[PDB]
Amino acid sequence: NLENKTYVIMGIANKRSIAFGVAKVLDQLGAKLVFTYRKERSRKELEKLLEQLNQPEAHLYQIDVQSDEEVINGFEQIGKDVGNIDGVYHSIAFANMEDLRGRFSETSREGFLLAQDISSYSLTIVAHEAKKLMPEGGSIVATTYLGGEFAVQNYNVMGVAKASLEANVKYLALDLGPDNIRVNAISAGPIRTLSAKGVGGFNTILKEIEERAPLKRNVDQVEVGKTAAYLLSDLSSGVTGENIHVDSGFHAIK
Amino acid sequence: NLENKTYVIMGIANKRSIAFGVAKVLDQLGAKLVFTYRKERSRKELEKLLEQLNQPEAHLYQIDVQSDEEVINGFEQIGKDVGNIDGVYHSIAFANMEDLRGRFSETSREGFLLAQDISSYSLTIVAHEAKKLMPEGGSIVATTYLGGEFAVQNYNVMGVAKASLEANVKYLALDLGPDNIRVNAISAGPIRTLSAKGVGGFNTILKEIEERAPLKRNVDQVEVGKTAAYLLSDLSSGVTGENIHVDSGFHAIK
Amino acid sequence: VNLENKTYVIMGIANKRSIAFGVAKVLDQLGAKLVFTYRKERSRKELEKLLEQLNQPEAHLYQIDVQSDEEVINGFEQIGKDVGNIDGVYHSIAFANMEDLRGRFSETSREGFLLAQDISSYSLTIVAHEAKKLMPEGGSIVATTYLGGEFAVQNYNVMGVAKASLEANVKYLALDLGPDNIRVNAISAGPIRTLSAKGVGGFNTILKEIEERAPLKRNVDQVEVGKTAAYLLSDLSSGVTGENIHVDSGFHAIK
Amino acid sequence: VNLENKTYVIMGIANKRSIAFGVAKVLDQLGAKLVFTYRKERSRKELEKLLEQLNQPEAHLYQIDVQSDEEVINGFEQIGKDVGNIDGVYHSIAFANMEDLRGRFSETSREGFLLAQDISSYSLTIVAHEAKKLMPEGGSIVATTYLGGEFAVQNYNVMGVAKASLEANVKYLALDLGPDNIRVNAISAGPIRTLSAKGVGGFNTILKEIEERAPLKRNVDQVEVGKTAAYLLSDLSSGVTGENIHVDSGFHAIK
Ligand SMILES: NC(=O)c1ccc[n+]([C@@H]2O[C@H](COP(=O)([O-])OP(=O)(O)OC[C@H]3O[C@@H](n4cnc5c(N)ncnc54)[C@H](OP(=O)(O)O)[C@@H]3O)[C@@H](O)[C@H]2O)c1
Ligand SMILES: NC(=O)c1ccc[n+]([C@@H]2O[C@H](COP(=O)([O-])OP(=O)(O)OC[C@H]3O[C@@H](n4cnc5c(N)ncnc54)[C@H](OP(=O)(O)O)[C@@H]3O)[C@@H](O)[C@H]2O)c1
Ligand SMILES: NC(=O)c1ccc[n+]([C@@H]2O[C@H](COP(=O)([O-])OP(=O)(O)OC[C@H]3O[C@@H](n4cnc5c(N)ncnc54)[C@H](OP(=O)(O)O)[C@@H]3O)[C@@H](O)[C@H]2O)c1
Ligand SMILES: NC(=O)c1ccc[n+]([C@@H]2O[C@H](COP(=O)([O-])OP(=O)(O)OC[C@H]3O[C@@H](n4cnc5c(N)ncnc54)[C@H](OP(=O)(O)O)[C@@H]3O)[C@@H](O)[C@H]2O)c1
Ligand SMILES: Oc1cc(Cl)ccc1Oc1ccccc1
Ligand SMILES: Oc1cc(Cl)ccc1Oc1ccccc1
Ligand SMILES: Oc1cc(Cl)ccc1Oc1ccccc1
Ligand SMILES: Oc1cc(Cl)ccc1Oc1ccccc1
Ligand SMILES: N[C@@H](CCC(=O)O)C(=O)O
Ligand SMILES: N[C@@H](CCC(=O)O)C(=O)O
Ligand SMILES: N[C@@H](CCC(=O)O)C(=O)O
Numbered sequence A, B: 001n002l003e004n005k006t007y008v009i010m011g012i013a014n015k016r017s018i019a020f021g022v023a024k025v026l027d028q029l030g031a032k033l034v035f036t037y038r039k040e041r042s043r044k045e046l047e048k049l050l051e052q053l054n055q056p057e058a059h060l061y062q063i064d065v066q067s068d069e070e071v072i073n074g075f076e077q078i079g080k081d082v083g084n085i086d087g088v089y090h091s092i093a094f095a096n097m098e099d100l101r102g103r104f105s106e107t108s109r110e111g112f113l114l115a116q117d118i119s120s121y122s123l124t125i126v127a128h129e130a131k132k133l134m135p136e137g138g139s140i141v142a143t144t145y146l147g148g149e150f151a152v153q154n155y156n157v158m159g160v161a162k163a164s165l166e167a168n169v170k171y172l173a174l175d176l177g178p179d180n181i182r183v184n185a186i187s188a189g190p191i192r193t194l195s196a197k198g199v200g201g202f203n204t205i206l207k208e209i210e211e212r213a214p215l216k217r218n219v220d221q222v223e224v225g226k227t228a229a230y231l232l233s234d235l236s237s238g239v240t241g242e243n244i245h246v247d248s249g250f251h252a253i254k
Numbered sequence C, D: 001v002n003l004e005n006k007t008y009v010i011m012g013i014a015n016k017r018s019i020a021f022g023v024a025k026v027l028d029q030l031g032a033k034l035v036f037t038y039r040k041e042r043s044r045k046e047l048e049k050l051l052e053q054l055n056q057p058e059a060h061l062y063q064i065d066v067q068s069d070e071e072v073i074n075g076f077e078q079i080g081k082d083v084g085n086i087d088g089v090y091h092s093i094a095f096a097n098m099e100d101l102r103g104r105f106s107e108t109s110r111e112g113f114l115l116a117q118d119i120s121s122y123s124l125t126i127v128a129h130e131a132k133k134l135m136p137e138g139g140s141i142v143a144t145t146y147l148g149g150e151f152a153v154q155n156y157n158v159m160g161v162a163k164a165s166l167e168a169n170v171k172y173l174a175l176d177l178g179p180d181n182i183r184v185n186a187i188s189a190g191p192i193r194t195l196s197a198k199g200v201g202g203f204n205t206i207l208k209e210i211e212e213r214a215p216l217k218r219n220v221d222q223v224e225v226g227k228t229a230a231y232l233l234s235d236l237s238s239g240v241t242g243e244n245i246h247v248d249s250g251f252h253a254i255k
Helices: A018-028 A040-052 A068-082 A109-133 A156-179 A202-212 A221-232 B018-028 B040-052 B068-082 B109-131 B157-179 B202-212 B221-232 C019-029 C041-053 C069-083 C110-132 C157-180 C203-213 C222-233 D019-029 D041-053 D069-083 D110-132 D157-180 D203-213 D222-233
Strands: A006-010 A032-037 A060-062 A087-090 A138-144 A181-188 A243-246 B006-010 B032-037 B060-062 B087-090 B138-144 B181-188 B243-246 C007-011 C033-038 C060-063 C088-091 C139-145 C182-189 C244-247 D007-011 D033-038 D061-063 D088-091 D139-145 D182-189 D244-247
Touching: A006 A018, A006 A068, A018 A032, A018 A040, A018 A087, A018 A221, A032 A040, A032 A068, A040 A060, A060 A068, A068 A109, A087 A109, A087 A221, A109 A138, A109 A156, A109 A181, A109 D110, A109 D157, A138 A156, A138 A221, A156 A181, A156 D110, A156 D157, A181 A221, A221 A243, B006 B018, B006 B068, B018 B032, B018 B040, B018 B087, B018 B221, B032 B040, B032 B068, B040 B060, B060 B068, B068 B109, B087 B109, B087 B221, B109 B138, B109 B157, B109 B181, B109 C110, B138 B157, B138 B221, B157 B181, B157 C157, B181 B221, B221 B243, C007 C019, C007 C069, C019 C033, C019 C041, C019 C088, C019 C222, C033 C041, C033 C069, C041 C060, C060 C069, C069 C110, C088 C110, C088 C222, C110 C139, C110 C157, C110 C182, C139 C157, C139 C222, C157 C182, C182 C222, C222 C244, D007 D019, D007 D069, D019 D033, D019 D041, D019 D088, D019 D222, D033 D041, D033 D069, D041 D061, D061 D069, D069 D110, D088 D110, D088 D222, D110 D139, D110 D157, D110 D182, D139 D157, D139 D222, D157 D182, D182 D222, D222 D244
Parallel strands: A006 A032, A006 A087, A032 A060, A087 A138, A138 A181, A181 A243, B006 B032, B006 B087, B032 B060, B087 B138, B138 B181, B181 B243, C007 C033, C007 C088, C033 C060, C088 C139, C139 C182, C182 C244, D007 D033, D007 D088, D033 D061, D088 D139, D139 D182, D182 D244
Antiparallel strands: none
16 A cells, blocks of 8 residues: 555656556555656646546646756656655656667667667666655666567667666666665566557567467556556565566566 | 465475565465475474464465375365465475585485475476466466576575576466466575575675675565565566566676 | 597487587587497497598497486596596487477476486586596586577477576586686577477477577578587687577577 | 688777787687777777787778767778778777766766767667678677676676667667678676776776686686687677677676
8 A cells, every 4th residue: 555655657648658557556556646747748648637546636747858957857846846755657768760660770879879868868867866855765667678688670779778778777776775765677568559659560569479478468557557566665675676577478488 | 455365375384484474474465375384393383373373264284295196185175175276375495405515516316306306396286286276367476596597606406496496487377377377486585594594605695685785685584475465466467477586686786 | 719639528419410410520520539428229320320421530439328327427437548538528418208398388297307307407417527527627518408498488398497407507517617627508509400309399380480580580500509519618718607608590689 | 710811890909908909819810801990099009019919911990989970981981992891890899987987877977878878889780780781791790798788786887788788789780680691799708907997996806706706716818708709700600699608707607
């Protein structure tokens, strides 16, 4: 139970977002939630989805993780509005569509560095600023994909940025561990979301899971959220620097 | 909440067993529990340990995992007395003490096959027998150590037996996944227990976690039990063939 | 690589398609003196005629069933008297009953599970203990594994567990023997048509998936495994121990 | 090995202690023609002194700052006009600010993080793209990584996230370029005292932990990295791709 606990959830675009899976689960367990968004359209979606939640107050902050000033001021404002928090769910990534299909060897520098910036660096700066609101410790979770551990077709520039993210989680775990702040990753299997439309061959990936993965079925957003609940809570206190696969066992097979 | 769940916990020897840590967490959460032990000396012990839980019944069965018939009849009796189960915590391993120190290259065939048998194969046979009591599915968790993934001073024959176990998990996950039976490992940090007295250099291992692991501290039997509650419940429903390190972040550093 | 003046024990040739025979042709091509161990008389007969293909001046052949402590102990002790000190050992030995290489892993028998471990994993430990006696100045031991030990693969079953055990064995052997300057490593070979592959269910599907999905879009062969063996058994790999080199067209790196 | 008639581009020699200079001594001794690329004028100057221990009859030296596309694009094009087709590339380039390396990882600045990615990871992708034009019939590309990419090690900080990225880059490049018969691999070198190492906090106690704890109980040197690179750049390692080979006395295999 997560009553009297407060979590910042970053990166809901709409009802299919993985972060909205997380939100539904933490809200059901009684947490207070704060939400961050980039696009105006995502604030609108967030105001609509809050009616499904039991949060008595909408706490919505615009944070583009490309901007230091936005991350620093956003968290500073969260802290002024709700006090100390207990953890952060990071559910944010981006790459240019043309870097998620075709040949990897042709990725542009700005494309590679944009992926890195949003998808991996954002976690370091978020952790640095969120730590100011966790004086007594807490928990930070980021969303990764099996394409960060192995070359999968079409995932390209995002795989290299997932590899970077998963290491960023381990370096943060080491750095922040003596502050009693745990940092972990959830490696979600494929899920139909807005961002998934940019992964060439997504539908093929989906069915390969059904066909080959141990559980012979795809996972959904709520399953990711139930693992997020474990990682964000005291159920997982001994656990830091870890990557938990919520992917029907696919990571364990070949 | 594990009310109306039944779990079989294997491998309680005394108050310091990891499995009594698991027992305690699941008991607090409303689980009915069934226990298995090897020798009477653990039985009498066991019976007194249970007056610290709120099981209204002492469901207790002798099972030496070296005998097929005792594992077969043991699970058979468990089903007759308490019907279907929701999963199994496996907390069982053994090696002869001279193989847990000195030079690995001098391990005997007998001692090697004995560690494999008790520490690894026993999950396969237990899985096959447990499954008969999980027609709607369920969850199997084994306990492993970082020694299965890396060579570690002294742990020697038990490291090749853990490597074996960790692969056994994976292969059981693939096999039993279509029956909705999930199989996972918890990789526990070092913990002072009866078995840990057999491991050469054990105190040096304890101390090194405190100096070097991200959280700068040792884990305990209840932190293992907490993660076992995650793995054994529906929070982990999309998680299988997984190895979760409950070890203060130690797996994640070098 | 120059292997003139060097002597290697290659264990586990049954016929011309053996992975160890690939190893043998490369080392032989490289100037090395080779010693061979076999279990079955039929395998010794294959060695006898496969040796006409090689440049070995004489046939050093020893029956070693790795299930027997006596046979491993006396075979290496014999090897040491006949050829003197050795430079390393190529281990290419596995076994599992056929029932245990298809269908349901969860049905595996104890006797079948310990059989696969005994032959395919423990044999490396004892072979190293006895081989070390002949490498007073250091040396190099290489064993043969499969991706099935790092991931659950359909049908590979009791063997993938035996290969996990093997790969841990190499690391623990590496740590123990490193002070003696004896390096210990694994080659993880892609699928190759051999006599033992005949017992692994869906083998043909395995080979086809490699060709369609692995980076190199082709299968590897025994000689390619031999080349990496030559690297691993020679001074080119000084500094490398406890390592598992995958010779598999890149397959291990993709999902 | 045997490498006469092969031409390799070697990127990242600064001085006589560079890991790349060890690669180059091994390749040169094996008969290869070598082409060198450098960033700083002082590195060129060192290259010219060092070529003198080499059996290279021609200094082929090209300035390439891997921060600039046009420099990588033009340098390789120029290399093509000067030596023609090439057999492989040794990439031995990384960089990170002292200001981010020697403060807490969580305080790494955006520009510092992205500097290290750009120079130490992205540089391989663009180099691979331009090198491929000179490998019509296949080739081999090797980059230099460090255990810090796979585990959080104290002090290495922003460079371990850059190495993690580099190591994914190898895999993704091996997958993309394998159909062109171009193999891409990494060497994970142990600590070696170089100009760059002077940037890594606590470097001396890292050297000492290797002597004390690594299976081989010693450190490795640049020449050892060069020997594993000759294996990787040569037909010895055909069938090997997307691989990370650890030249670290086996320190990767232990805990
Ligand atoms: N779907 C999958 O199968 C899958 C699998 C494994 C991992 N993941 C990971 O899960 C995470 C969430 O993705 P999703 O699939 O749930 O898709 P999503 O709904 O499209 O969410 C992606 C989010 O990232 C936010 N974002 C992008 N750039 C940002 C920026 N510069 N600053 C702040 N926010 C930014 C987007 O916000 P705006 O819309 O406001 O721009 C959006 O809310 C990603 O890390 C993804 O890589 C997804
Ligand atoms: N403690 C640690 O630091 C550590 C760390 C990582 C992983 N683990 C793992 O945790 C698990 C539990 O060990 P522990 O530390 O909790 O020690 P423990 O309290 O001594 O428990 C070991 C149990 O194994 C049982 N056992 C041994 N052989 C058996 C057999 N043939 N049949 C049935 N039961 C058998 C023992 O029963 P009897 O006493 O009745 O013989 C005992 O209850 C083991 O798998 C261990 O390897 C331990
Ligand atoms: N083929 C593949 O796709 C593949 C892939 C990866 C790894 N591997 C591994 O490569 C190694 C060689 O196998 P292979 O495919 O080359 O098949 P093979 O030609 O069938 O070789 C197997 C060898 O093991 C020997 N052997 C079995 N039990 C023995 C025992 N108790 N004592 C002494 N020798 C014993 C056999 O000798 P006898 O016939 O005389 O009994 C035979 O020479 C094995 O470890 C296998 O797991 C093979
Ligand atoms: N030494 C170790 O303990 C160790 C261990 C494992 C891995 N490594 C890796 O080995 C590789 C070689 O490093 P090292 O130890 O040999 O150090 P080094 O002698 O200082 O070599 C590093 C090279 O990187 C080059 N470089 C940096 N920025 C560049 C740029 N923008 N464009 C072109 N070249 C650039 C430098 O050239 P300029 O001098 O012209 O700027 C220098 O030649 C690096 O990737 C390092 O991370 C080193
Ligand atoms: O990381 C993702 C993996 C899958 Cl399988 C589908 C969607 C994913 O999310 C993104 C994919 C590319 C760019 C940004 C987010
Ligand atoms: O697996 C164990 C690891 C550690 Cl660190 C301590 C105790 C452990 O449990 C056993 C260790 C050796 C033999 C049997 C059980
Ligand atoms: O280990 C092997 C892997 C593959 Cl894909 C094919 C054959 C192999 O060799 C053996 C497989 C099973 C039993 C003994 C040897
Ligand atoms: O990557 C390195 C690892 C070690 Cl241990 C020492 C030196 C290394 O090389 C660099 C370290 C930091 C920035 C540039 C290169
Ligand atoms: N968007 C994918 C379509 C293929 C699929 O999803 O299967 C592509 O353009 O490659
Ligand atoms: N070996 C297979 C036959 C077909 C195949 O190899 O794919 C089996 O017995 O199942
Ligand atoms: N390089 C260290 C000094 C001593 C060491 O290498 O251990 C530092 O400047 O932080």
